[PDB]
Design a protein around this ligand. Sequence first.
Ligand SMILES: Nc1ncnc2c1ncn2[C@@H]1O[C@H](COP(=O)(O)OP(=O)(O)O)[C@@H](O)[C@H]1O
Ligand SMILES: Nc1ncnc2c1ncn2[C@@H]1O[C@H](COP(=O)(O)OP(=O)(O)O)[C@@H](O)[C@H]1O
Ligand SMILES: [Mg+2]
Ligand SMILES: [Mg+2]
Lengths: 375, 375, 160, 74, 126, 82, 82
Amino acid sequence: DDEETTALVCDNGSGLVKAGFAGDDAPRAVFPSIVGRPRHQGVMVGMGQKDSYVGDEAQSKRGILTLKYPIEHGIITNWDDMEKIWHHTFYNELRVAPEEHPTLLTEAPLNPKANREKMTQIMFETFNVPAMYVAIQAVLSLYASGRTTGIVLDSGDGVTHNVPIYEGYALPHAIMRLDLAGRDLTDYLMKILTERGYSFVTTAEREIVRDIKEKLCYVALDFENEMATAASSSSLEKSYELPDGQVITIGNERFRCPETLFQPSFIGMESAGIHETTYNSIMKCDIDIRKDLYANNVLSGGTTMYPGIADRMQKEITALAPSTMKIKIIAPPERKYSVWIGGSILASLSTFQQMWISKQEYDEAGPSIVHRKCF
Amino acid sequence: DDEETTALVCDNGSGLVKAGFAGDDAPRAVFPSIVGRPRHQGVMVGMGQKDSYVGDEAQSKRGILTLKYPIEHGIITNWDDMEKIWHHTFYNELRVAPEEHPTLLTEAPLNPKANREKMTQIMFETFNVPAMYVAIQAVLSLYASGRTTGIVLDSGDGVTHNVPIYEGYALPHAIMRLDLAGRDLTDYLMKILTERGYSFVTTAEREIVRDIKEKLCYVALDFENEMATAASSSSLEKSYELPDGQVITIGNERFRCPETLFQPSFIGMESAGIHETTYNSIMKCDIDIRKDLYANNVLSGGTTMYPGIADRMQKEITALAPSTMKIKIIAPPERKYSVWIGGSILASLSTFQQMWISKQEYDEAGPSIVHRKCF
Amino acid sequence: DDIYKAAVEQLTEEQKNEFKAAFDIFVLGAEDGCISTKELGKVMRMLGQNPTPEELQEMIDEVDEDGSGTVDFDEFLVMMVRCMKDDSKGKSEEELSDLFRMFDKNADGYIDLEELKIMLQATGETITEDDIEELMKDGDKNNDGRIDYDEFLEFMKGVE
Amino acid sequence: GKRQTEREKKKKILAERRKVLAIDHLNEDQLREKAKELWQSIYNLEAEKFDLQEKFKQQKYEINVLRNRINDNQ
Amino acid sequence: ISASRKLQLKTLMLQIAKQELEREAEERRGEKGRALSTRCQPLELAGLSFAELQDLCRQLHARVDKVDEERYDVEAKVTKNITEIADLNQKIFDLRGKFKRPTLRRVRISADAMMQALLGARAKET
Amino acid sequence: AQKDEEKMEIQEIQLKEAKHIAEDADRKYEEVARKLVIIESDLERAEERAELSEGKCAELEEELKTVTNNLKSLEAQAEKYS
Amino acid sequence: AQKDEEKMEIQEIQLKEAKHIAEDADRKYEEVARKLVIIESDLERAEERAELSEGKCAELEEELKTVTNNLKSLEAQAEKYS
Ligand SMILES: Nc1ncnc2c1ncn2[C@@H]1O[C@H](COP(=O)(O)OP(=O)(O)O)[C@@H](O)[C@H]1O
Ligand SMILES: Nc1ncnc2c1ncn2[C@@H]1O[C@H](COP(=O)(O)OP(=O)(O)O)[C@@H](O)[C@H]1O
Ligand SMILES: [Mg+2]
Ligand SMILES: [Mg+2]
């Protein structure tokens, strides 16, 4: 590289911040988005103890911290912590001053306006970027698949949203946003582990339960048969070693944790599972583009990485859909970073180069410029 | 040396007072902390007989004195005698007036407040030091090892306490203080020696029993096998010459005296041994720092100098702990003075130079300043 | 030990003979002329200090240049001058870092032989190539070929 | 408060450096003495700006050294 | 190769350090000279249009405000970089610091005392 | 004086016995320490090789799990195909 | 005779100190030997664990390759039936 100017494709997310320069294949730095102040007193003098460890540093000292995510469900609830996370991302994980780089944030659909306006105001006043643009997290995941149609189910860690798109024309009346995501699955797993004796309570042990969920849980193809099998044999019980020994054995908690996605009544949510909100999102579309959406169903986001979900979802939709249509579920192996790869592709386009919100435009219309033509 | 001002690192302890200027390797003057008034009448006139011999002088005239320690279990029970001991330490063993030197006392954890407040009031009113600071006896022993984590078992002569520390953040809810220490082992040895015919009763003969304990006793690797071996062969019987002749032969009293540490039921104490209070102190800590505490178990204090204790303790903890964790027991050869070496290191730090309790601060808030920010 | 070795070297033959008379005063009864833990321990017991042989062996290892485990007359002389200490505090770390950066005119984060020989030319004194190679090897234990911040810090560790 | 923090730094520095400046009433001597005070302020600003640029160069050097030691830490 | 040569090498390194310090001082002197030479210009205000002088003073005050704004921006950036450098140095110190704390050894009395202890009662002249 | 000379003689006997036993014990202790160093080095090497084998086994199990899940899915797919 | 007695007392003092040194050396020797035996047992256990892990890894590799071949065959059959 050299002259010229590259764009910063940041992607706030909720659970893992993924960032990197535009035009690559994978994000340069991926690290949890947690800011944890120490909670004990501290007796050693001169140890160089900081007041807040952010990012991946607080996943190593988590034994004496109180980690707290600054993004609850897509929306940002603690602006100071989010500013700290952004500052860390720019200066220590990428080491590029923001004064010389455009930024491309990402935002979930149907989010509060004030969140987006505050985001752009921060990026323009504190970090003082040249130009920033905010994009919907599902259109990027559709970019990365190399398609131009299809209905994308982007089940992140904060919020699961399902944006249908045809021929490049998004259908704003058919977006079905559901707030069940990876975090609720972690909490439900932590709640059902107590049925064997293992109690995880501290906010640090939520990370251990998350690791258990990632490494062991899988989505059952048929729920009742698995419940019957796990209750008779013992071929499912997989063991796992805690960060201090005392291995634990997970029985039928393995496929009961991610089953909450298809039956949100487990955690008390009323709505229908991710297998039926996709069909409802399709049926709201026009009668002539339903075949294409049926054939190009796209999966993205981290939580759709459970082993065996691309078959359960296809079976469910085939049960719901008319018998003639072909149901195909696109599940690329690079699912987790699909949104960021799409963001890189979009930022690398020449046609897109004039859509950025230039700073002089913000100076003339204020932060409310984001809702205007420069979307 | 020259200009400038050095700090006095005193360490009251209970059984041996260790003192010396900050920045050296070993304490300058180490002497027992006993004050013994004469008890007989005295007929020679003009012999220059004093009314109280303190320190190492009363370990040579102990034949006609009644030695009495001024510190029972960490706490100080006889303030006049303790003041006398401090006066001797400053003026005759170091020969430095306290008006020109900061002092750094040491105190066991979980001690009564009034003891600490009276200590600071004495140091500021009677000896009139410029500034004094009180530190917990275990953090210093952790300084001396050059670590920054680890759980330190400081089995002194008065009280055995077990302070776990991680990354410089002490865990106040996991301190397990047990009042079995070297003095109770001396009394128990003096009590089991009577099973062979040797009766030591006088407070002067307690010193002889202490010498026997120091020179002969050792901790058995396996208790039952040693009890069986000592009851069949005679390869263990080691003899020792009293201060007047009449050698004595110690049989299986050798490893039964220090075994009380691991089975406090011998002296009627209910609690568990030093091998199980360490494991309990670890298990109260968080689940993510238990591996580091397992790997960095530190021994300190005088009573942990028994030949063969660093193996018995490791065997016991390995029996208790999960099989995967590695158990390592740090037993430096300079165990006895570990607390004082750590005190010297702490007093020599530049970052610590503003933590002293300056005299004007005491004048403004009274002796209760010690519990405040200047801990 | 290095400053002590220099001080012993700066002694003339007469001063070395005086220090050898001191040696004979110290080493009374030594079989090999080398003060192992035996003579040093008996002397320490005579002095009023009650040490352990570990400290004496560490004193030897700071001065044992062959690895034989003994303290010959030269190493014994270093033991003798170890009774007094002056090489302390290593000057100032900030000063050394700044002057190391000044040495690193190219600011590579490590010192090259080119800038080293440039500064030697500025000084202009006679240069021992073998000693230069020894210094480079001791600094470049990681075998990078260039003296680093930690490498030169350990070069001056314990030195004045 | 971040936008308020930026506005605050800029606006409060301006307010500290802003004064009620009425050049009309001052005669030649007072006007020239005020110009001298302004030149002293310029000298101070330039000296501290050059200190800042030298500190910036030292900061770049320190960052390079820290990166090198991070590389050496593996 | 000898210990004398090692002392010569140490003295040479000290002399190199002194020369670098002197060169840093002369570089600072050059920086001061260049800064004074290149920055501004003196003003002669004798007997001119005094209202025009007031307007020129106002324009110079505006220029001073601009210079102050740029100076304050660079000052804030320098302070932020200093904070980042302190944080990184703290990280390095916590990573590879630890027991590198030096100490002194004073338990062993001087060589004269050791020699007089070995001599016994003979050591009176020395 | 006769008794004192007898005591001197038995003293010298004890001196010789003690010093010879001490030299033998020192030599044996040095040999034992050398053997301990050897065994400790071998133990540490075995431990690190075991850790490497653990990592390898973990990676293999992950790959096996992935492949088995894909296999079962495609087998069901072929059943539906027929 | 009195001079001989004093020399005898000095010899006895030296004898006692030599006995102390010898006994301390012996105790250190035996303790180091015990630690050596313990380290030997630990190294044996580590050898066992590493060998078990290696056998596990070889078995996992073979089963992985077999299942991979089955997977590829079923993939080809699935494409044919498609
Ligand atoms: N391999 C995996 N298997 C199962 N769940 C995973 C896996 N990787 C990540 N997850 C879940 O997905 C979440 C990360 O989702 P991510 O896509 O990073 O969210 P975001 O959209 O905020 O970036 C984690 O919290 C975790 O619960
Ligand atoms: N070499 C030794 N072997 C066995 N026990 C010892 C030894 N040295 C000291 N002790 C015991 O330790 C006590 C001294 O402990 P110390 O650490 O001085 O206590 P404090 O913490 O009050 O300073 C003595 O009373 C003695 O019983
Ligand atoms: Mg996402
Ligand atoms: Mg103590």
